[PDB]
């Protein structure tokens, strides 16, 4: 049920985007499967121009289906903006406008599924066309080219950051809002309560995606070492290409979402600090 697996992003104020997590993972999986299958042989490596153009075409089609939910999405932005710029009517309004966005996504599910299946059929056809001269000595050069091109730099980027310290910094910010809210004994209190509730949900999703990143970074690093500078039997090579495509897709989904949610958290934190300023300095 994709209704329970949708992330909501607000990277900048007045903006809203959604990610149906199972579709993001699925499209990314067949993207990695497509590149591994063509990079395997020099005679097929040149098909990257056509793969890049097909993936671009699939992304535009997916975004065209997402655009069908734009009026409902913009209606939800207007309510969030009203609830953040100072109540039960507004909180009721927010809950039913968010439910409407999830219903709109759910109403066009087969449209998304049709696009996901085009990507699967494309990735699977290339994967089925994978051939070895000797099915006992299948080279793994394609696994290395695809890892160097699409994965390696994301692993380095992750390892250069302290994602656990980022979580700790976010809990410190949330605790300071709780402290301010506790000792505040108004309409401003209701907006401080609503913004803090959004930030805590955003934080819980950041912590969820961060756990997946830390786990898949160790797994990708260990598994790449076992699947390169070696030959495999054809069936073993195919299974290890599906295994890596799965590992990469789970990692990339969480990495992309954690960054989008991190931006969403600090955009709401900047707005909350302005409310704290107007309430303390310009009001009481």
């Amino acid at each position: 049920n994709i209704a329970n697996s949708i992330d909501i992003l607000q990277e900048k104020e007045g903006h809203l985007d959604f990610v149906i997590i199972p579709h993001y993972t699925f499209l990314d999986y067949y993207k990695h499967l497509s590149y591994n299958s063509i990079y395997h042989k020099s005679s097929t490596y040149g098909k990257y121009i056509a793969v890049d153009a097909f993936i671009k075409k699939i992304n535009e089609a997916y975004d065209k289906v997402k655009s069908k939910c734009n009026d409902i999405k913009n209606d939800l932005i207007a309510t969030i903006k009203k609830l953040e710029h100072p109540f039960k009517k507004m909180m009721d309004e927010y809950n039913t406008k968010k439910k409407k966005l999830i219903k709109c996504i759910k109403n066009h599910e087969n449209d998304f599924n049709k696009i996901c299946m085009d990507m699967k059929n494309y990735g699977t056809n290339l994967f089925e066309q994978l051939s070895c001269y000797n099915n006992n000595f299948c080279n793994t050069n394609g696994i290395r080219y695809h890892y160097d091109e699409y994965i390696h730099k994301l692993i380095l980027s992750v390892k250069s950051k302290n994602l656990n310290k980022d979580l700790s910094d976010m809990t410190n910010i949330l605790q300071q809002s709780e402290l301010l809210l506790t000792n505040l004994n108004y309409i401003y209190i209701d907006t401080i309560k609503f913004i803090h509730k959004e930030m805590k949900h955003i934080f819980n999703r950041i912590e969820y995606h961060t756990k997946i990143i830390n786990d898949k970074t160790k797994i990708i690093q260990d598994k790449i070492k076992l699947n390169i500078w070696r030959t495999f039997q054809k069936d073993e090579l195919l299974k290890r290409i599906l295994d890596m495509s799965n590992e990469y897709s789970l990692f990339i989904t969480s990495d992309h979402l954690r960054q989008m949610l991190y931006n969403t958290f600090y955009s709401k934190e900047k707005h909350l600090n302005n409310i704290f300023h107007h309430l303390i300095y310009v009001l009481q």
């Epitope: 020099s42 490596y45 070895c132 001269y133 000797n134 006992n136 000595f137 299948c138 080279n139 050069n141 290395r144 080219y145 890892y147 160097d148 390696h152 380095l156 790449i224 070492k225 390169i228 500078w229 030959t231």
Partner: single-chain antibody, 227 residues
């Protein structure tokens, strides 16, 4: 990527020399870096290599004990330390990502002045032609270059004056990107041929065959000059 090596050296016999190789992008990702030297009167000679992601080193038997190859853990720098230097060690030393599909690139070379299983036989040693004349270079290996995977690991390099070697043909007959159609490769097993339908001034330099069936060994070279 581009590879940048440390500067020129003049060493006494019995001393050590350590050459560095930095990747422009900061990493060697999951690929290999190999060290190849070239003495004044000889063809290239492979010393050893490293796959930094695996921490796997491979050394040429004649250099085992004298060569140590290392890599920076997260710094994108490879090293080659040659100890107990002799006058025979005077050479241009190169680090390279050797003949890896569409990837072949070299460092600028490090001048060091001291003050194999598969043997490659190249023919002829020198070739003098006028522009437009065809040219042919042969290479014979002591063992077959055909691998159980169905690839024949035969390569052709051209080293132009004042330049690092450049890959022309991969796995017997595949022209590298940018290589004009006048260059062509043929052969199987142990006998291979590089042809130039018509020679042009820019073709001048030393051509070397390289085998990667038992990585790595090279031919002595074919110096091609105009008129």
């Amino acid at each position: 990527v581009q590879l940048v090596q440390s500067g020129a050296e003049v060493k006494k016999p019995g001393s050590s020399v350590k050459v560095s190789c930095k990747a422009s992008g900061g990493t060697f990702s999951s690929y290999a870096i190999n060290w190849v030297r070239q003495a004044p009167g000889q063809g290239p000679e492979w010393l050893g290599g490293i796959i930094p992601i695996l921490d796997r080193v491979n050394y040429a038997q004649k250099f085992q004990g004298r060569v140590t190859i290392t890599a920076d853990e997260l710094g994108g720098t490879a090293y080659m330390e040659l100890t107990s230097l002799r006058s025979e060690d005077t050479a241009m030393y190169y680090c390279a990502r050797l003949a890896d599909g569409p990837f072949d690139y070299w460092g600028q070379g490090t001048q060091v002045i001291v003050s194999s299983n598969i043997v490659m036989t190249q023919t002829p040693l020198s070739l003098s032609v006028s522009p437009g004349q065809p040219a042919s270079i042969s290479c014979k290996s002591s063992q077959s270059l055909l691998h159980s995977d169905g690839q024949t690991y035969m390569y052709w390099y051209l080293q132009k004056p004042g330049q690092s070697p450049q890959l022309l043909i991969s796995e017997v007959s595949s022209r590298f990107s940018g290589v004009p159609d006048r260059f062509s490769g043929s052969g199987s097993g142990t006998t291979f041929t590089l042809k130039i339908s018509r020679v042009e001034a820019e073709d001048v330099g030393v051509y070397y065959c390289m085998q990667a069936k038992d990585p790595y060994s090279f031919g002595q070279g074919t110096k091609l000059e105009i008129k």
